[PDB]
Amino acid sequence: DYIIKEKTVLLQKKDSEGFGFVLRGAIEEFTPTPAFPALQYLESVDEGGVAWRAGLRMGDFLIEVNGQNVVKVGHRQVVNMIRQGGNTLMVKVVMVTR
């Protein structure tokens, strides 16, 4: 009675462009739940964009960014980590499809 779809994908963009997605997230003490697995998730993904072509979609919760677990990480810190990778982003995500 709770189905979670997971996958790890690699994104590679060009200097000029972006990965093509809007990250929304964040209280303090977060306790993951099946319906609410992580703090940051994909509010929107530009169709046909880097992120989109790699297989990322709206509602995707970010579990790991470039190998680092971000389930309980703050928005700013996660954004920064994504920035850090430059033109590549390896991300593990989950889609709660219950």
Binding site: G18, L23, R24, G25, H75, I82
Partner: peptide, 6 residues
């Protein structure tokens, strides 16, 4: 919350 485009 807070959103951000990347």
């Amino acid at each position: 919350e807070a959103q951000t485009r990347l």
